[PDB]
Design a protein around this ligand. Sequence first.
Ligand SMILES: CC(C)(COP(=O)(O)OP(=O)(O)OC[C@H]1O[C@@H](n2cnc3c(N)ncnc32)[C@H](O)[C@@H]1OP(=O)(O)O)[C@@H](O)C(=O)NCCC(=O)NCCS
Ligand SMILES: CC(C)(COP(=O)(O)OP(=O)(O)OC[C@H]1O[C@@H](n2cnc3c(N)ncnc32)[C@H](O)[C@@H]1OP(=O)(O)O)[C@@H](O)C(=O)NCCC(=O)NCCS
Ligand SMILES: CC(C)(COP(=O)(O)OP(=O)(O)OC[C@H]1O[C@@H](n2cnc3c(N)ncnc32)[C@H](O)[C@@H]1OP(=O)(O)O)[C@@H](O)C(=O)NCCC(=O)NCCS
Lengths: 273, 273, 273
Amino acid sequence: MGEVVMSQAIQPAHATARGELSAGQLLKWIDTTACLAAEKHAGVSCVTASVDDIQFEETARVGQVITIKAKVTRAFSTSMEISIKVMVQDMLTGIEKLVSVAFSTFVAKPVGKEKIHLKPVTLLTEQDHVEHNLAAERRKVRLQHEDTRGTSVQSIELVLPPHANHHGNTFGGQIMAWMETVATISASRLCWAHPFLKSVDMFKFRGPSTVGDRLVFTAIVNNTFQTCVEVGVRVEAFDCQEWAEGRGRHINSAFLIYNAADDKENLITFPRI
Amino acid sequence: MGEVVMSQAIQPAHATARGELSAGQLLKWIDTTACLAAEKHAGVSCVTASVDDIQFEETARVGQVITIKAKVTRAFSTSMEISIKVMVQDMLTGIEKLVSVAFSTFVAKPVGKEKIHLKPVTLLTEQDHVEHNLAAERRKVRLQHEDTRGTSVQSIELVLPPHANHHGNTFGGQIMAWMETVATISASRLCWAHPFLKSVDMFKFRGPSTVGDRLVFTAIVNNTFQTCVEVGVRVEAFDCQEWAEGRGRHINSAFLIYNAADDKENLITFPRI
Amino acid sequence: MGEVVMSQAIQPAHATARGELSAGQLLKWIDTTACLAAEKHAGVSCVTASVDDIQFEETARVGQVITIKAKVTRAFSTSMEISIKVMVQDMLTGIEKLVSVAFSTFVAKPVGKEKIHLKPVTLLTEQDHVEHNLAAERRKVRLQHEDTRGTSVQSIELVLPPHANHHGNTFGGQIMAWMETVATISASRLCWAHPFLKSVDMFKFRGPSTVGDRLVFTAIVNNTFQTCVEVGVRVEAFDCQEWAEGRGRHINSAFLIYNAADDKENLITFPRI
Ligand SMILES: CC(C)(COP(=O)(O)OP(=O)(O)OC[C@H]1O[C@@H](n2cnc3c(N)ncnc32)[C@H](O)[C@@H]1OP(=O)(O)O)[C@@H](O)C(=O)NCCC(=O)NCCS
Ligand SMILES: CC(C)(COP(=O)(O)OP(=O)(O)OC[C@H]1O[C@@H](n2cnc3c(N)ncnc32)[C@H](O)[C@@H]1OP(=O)(O)O)[C@@H](O)C(=O)NCCC(=O)NCCS
Ligand SMILES: CC(C)(COP(=O)(O)OP(=O)(O)OC[C@H]1O[C@@H](n2cnc3c(N)ncnc32)[C@H](O)[C@@H]1OP(=O)(O)O)[C@@H](O)C(=O)NCCC(=O)NCCS
């Protein structure tokens, strides 16, 4: 019913040192599902234009099953809004818990110089009309949002073919995964404990990336508050030539909020800064 | 001696939540080895045409070493039959156990409009002639075989470059791996325990897949019997356009038989359906 | 300051059966960082020409963070020398330990028939001049170095797009990773315990490899001495046609020295051979 459904069993390969699902991996999965919904509407390849605020109510563990459902709520001109629901199920108890509810914005790409005009989302249920109207306000918010200490972390990732679509365009989800890895390192470096992602703030993907180009990641704590730490990550891009000349492209800047727990499952308080 | 040998140490990255080798990973490895044997005979790229019945006598664990040997038993016109032997060795005891003995059929692909004629397999030992004759009967069987409850699982995989050969053709082994993941989720969802793969029934790859296209996987228990559960998986393919229009290609349908164990190493009985 | 910095948290996906970082993975990371430094100097794609001796003072564990820093010490004509420093940090204690200090030689590749002339490394500090001079001697040594029992291991790897750069050239680091896997299997097969990499001897990458070609790996113990075992690995390459005809290309031959520990953290002595 307009939904794209992905199901993933959580393996050690998706895990952190604690037997928990890497938040970056989950973000990758989410972006993939959403992108598939978008492309299912568009009929052409789509890329992650932006992401709204994402909060995680639960942290999934190895052995559990993640279910991700994405849907196109509304098409505009070249962009569209995707609603995402993430559920976790324990396979010993049978219990389902909501992990996340979020929105992401995807943009349809032409092959060449094709203009692109998206057909409208067909509406049936009343809730379809409701979400169809809310999509406009949420979009307005998204657009207006573009009104815009030595424990730093630096990292670098080379963009290979499995990190982009078949046209060569880097996945926003991969970037989000790498981002999350680096940020987590920063948080850990502040608390010397075990950080788990509480949320990611809304941000835009400002420019495209391509296979073969370098992504420099710069993470640093921006603020702290009781049990929450905020890490800001910057993603800058260079093709080989740009890499040689030091002139990069600001791909994106995001803010990730973490909690943390020690080597016992008890929560901890971050120092003030 | 016509054999292709692969050796793989089993790491957490190849593991399930139980420290056992993912059956899908093993299937990937098997298909790869077999394909390498086939291409070693053909001199051109080959794809997985079909797979005979595969039974697993053992389940390998993290720390153990898998050895896979493949061989071309007989070439026909464009296809050939590959015999596969899978052994596991424990690296603390030195003990080897047979994991599997199976056959797979591979088809040589031309580059363009080239006709393809395969040279015969050279025969030395008598057992080479024996298997060369048996290959005909086994083939006859393969060809004749094409005479052809709410715990469902749905999943989706985007086919990226590491999932296909350099011409863009999706590996049958990758499809088998994904299949296995989804199916395992279904079985778990029936028993709420820990399923391990007992076997896979013979099936054909009905059509090609290509980088960039979506594979929709649909798993559902078809039957049960004492300690065995049967999960059927369907694999449907869509390029982006087909994805938009809902017209897919039936790539394949397979049937996987599992057992299961609880959080103790004791076997369990599945309910009747 | 001419440095390229990569930071990697160590996950189960990077781990062995013992919760330690795979040496091959570390080698991959090292080669990547170094290559990025090289390309940052050259402005074009670079490949691993050779590697000096690498010794590992520590073995990192899951949960710890690897930091790798690479730098171009000196450019010659088409080649350049890269100095690499590998540090590990425990994220519970905050303690850093040096893992490695090594040198690698990278070669700039033209796109077509372009001649390639590298600009000199700018020198500031005195240590920059010192290393700039030492680079010549170390190079002289590298060039002169090209003056050149049944527990064998054989394995095979198909080179896919994630294993090469965007021009199709296989990464030396991937080859080093595969090498290490196979070698480790050999060592384990000698001691029936848990080998960890002590060092790798300097070796040259004699020829290029390309996406789609097979890498046959042959590992075998060459010698033993008290607590050290030496495993030699050979890497031979075949495109599909070459694969069919049995005429390969000797890509490289390396020698890896291991120690080992039993299922207690106590070191062990290898038998004489
Ligand atoms: C997304 C992108 C195309 C928009 O760029 P732009 O400078 O804002 O140009 P436009 O104003 O014409 O925007 C075009 C569309 O993107 C939408 N858009 C722009 N900013 C947005 C935001 N912050 N949130 C949601 N949608 C946004 C616009 O509404 C417009 O949609 P419409 O045609 O249906 O009206 C461009 O920024 C981009 O290519 N970003 C990177 C996309 C990408 O490749 N991501 C993968 C990871 S690199
Ligand atoms: C395999 C395939 C080429 C055969 O298609 P087809 O409609 O049966 O056409 P053909 O009858 O001419 O079959 C050609 C060859 O495949 C063989 N073949 C067909 N069905 C087979 C089966 N079920 N089992 C074993 N071999 C089979 C035929 O014997 C024939 O071999 P030959 O030339 O040596 O006599 C085609 O079905 C296909 O492309 N499948 C997908 C292959 C693939 O890309 N797999 C990767 C995963 S998508
Ligand atoms: C590296 C390579 C280009 C040199 O080949 P060659 O037969 O020695 O030819 P050359 O003598 O002209 O060497 C060219 C450069 O490589 C350097 N070089 C050669 N052997 C070297 C070695 N053992 N160690 C360090 N540098 C070396 C030379 O000094 C020369 O550098 P310069 O132009 O700045 O003076 C060639 O061997 C090759 O392509 N190897 C594989 C590279 C690769 O693709 N690696 C990825 C894994 S396959």
